[PDB]
Amino acid sequence: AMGSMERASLIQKAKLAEQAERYEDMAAFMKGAVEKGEELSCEERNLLSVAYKNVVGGQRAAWRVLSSIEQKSNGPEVREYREKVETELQGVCDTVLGLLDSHLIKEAGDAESRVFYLKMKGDYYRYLAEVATGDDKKRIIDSARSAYQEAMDISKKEMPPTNPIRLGLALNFSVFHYEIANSPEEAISLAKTTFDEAMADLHTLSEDSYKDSTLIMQLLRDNLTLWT
């Protein structure tokens, strides 16, 4: 419904909405900006990702609360309301996936944009997989895996091992392995190898880049501590 608003005004309002913690508005403004058809800059990609991560993060937290209640109970109300939340979460994931497919990924030629969008694709299929059951769950899991793997292959060829996007991709793919794919050993191996290769490249970084990379490395180590 943002077709009448200037691209630059959508971007400015997405930044205001972030400041106001109005993440649904922020996501709608950034959807409108994507639908203008131009490629997104680095800052604009981050606004798109932060907006949807907050929207779907709230939905995932609510779905987990409701699923836990539903499982304790096993009237229709808890299941019905968990289903409503689940459908709304699926719709947000489908919206993000649709933006990536029309046409952000196909126009992304630089490694930093292409890896960023393919990591997002893996993440939103992963959130779909968290609520999926059975022999839909399998194809959704494979779609997440395939997106993360393409991003990994580009990131290893094109970015240094300390690049924050490369690090966050590896962190999230390791969580995919541990939590979705039932591959805890692959999760641990990926987190360890990523951490060690980043450590060995820290000497090349400025003070500010060092802070950026070590922050994400700490998350890899925190997961390794929890998993071992």
Place this chain on the structure above:
Amino acid sequence: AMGSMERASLIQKAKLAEQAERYEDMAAFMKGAVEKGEELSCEERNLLSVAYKNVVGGQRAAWRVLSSIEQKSNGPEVREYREKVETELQGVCDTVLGLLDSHLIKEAGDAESRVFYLKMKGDYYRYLAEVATGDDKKRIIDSARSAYQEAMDISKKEMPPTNPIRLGLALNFSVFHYEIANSPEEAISLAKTTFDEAMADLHTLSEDSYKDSTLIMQLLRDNLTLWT
């Protein structure tokens, strides 16, 4: 849009939505329950109030962030977006006021329900007054004042000075005086008199009622500390 759902199912889903921190859903479920046309029990009144307080609380916090940015700047974007948030806040306040007017207050004959709803009426006019300007602000302020005053008159005749609804009404009317009506001395006098009269009645209470009343008395004292 809740007309097809059973009253009891709306109430159950409002409780689930509170657990899931889905306050917009909670408010919609409780609006649907009110529109069934039956009076609300004490617990149901609290669910209605908690739902809308959280919805409008988020809107008020966002409006304050945006107004602060707008005032620092003085393109149209910050004003336009502050106006959008303001209109959505006004709409929620008008919805709550409409439920109270159709027909919760007129059917409320016991003091605990009538005072509860008239305090809500004062509160939602107060939130309208926070964003109003000029010679709309005056009539809105008077509507808040009139609702709080009727609730005060009933509460003093019908409830003990430690009743938590009576205490919270007096707390919020004192904030009205201090923040909206530019009457800080009336705010301080009301908070002090309310605190002192409650203190003198604490000896009549059980352990659990004492905890309920002293919690709100502490809020009166915290405001008095800030105001003096």
Place this chain on the structure above:
Amino acid sequence: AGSIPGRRS
């Protein structure tokens, strides 16, 4: 200052 927080229960 603080009105009733009123956001729980």
Place this chain on the structure above:
Amino acid sequence: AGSIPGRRS
């Protein structure tokens, strides 16, 4: 465990 929090900036 923790994915990228990714909810700020």
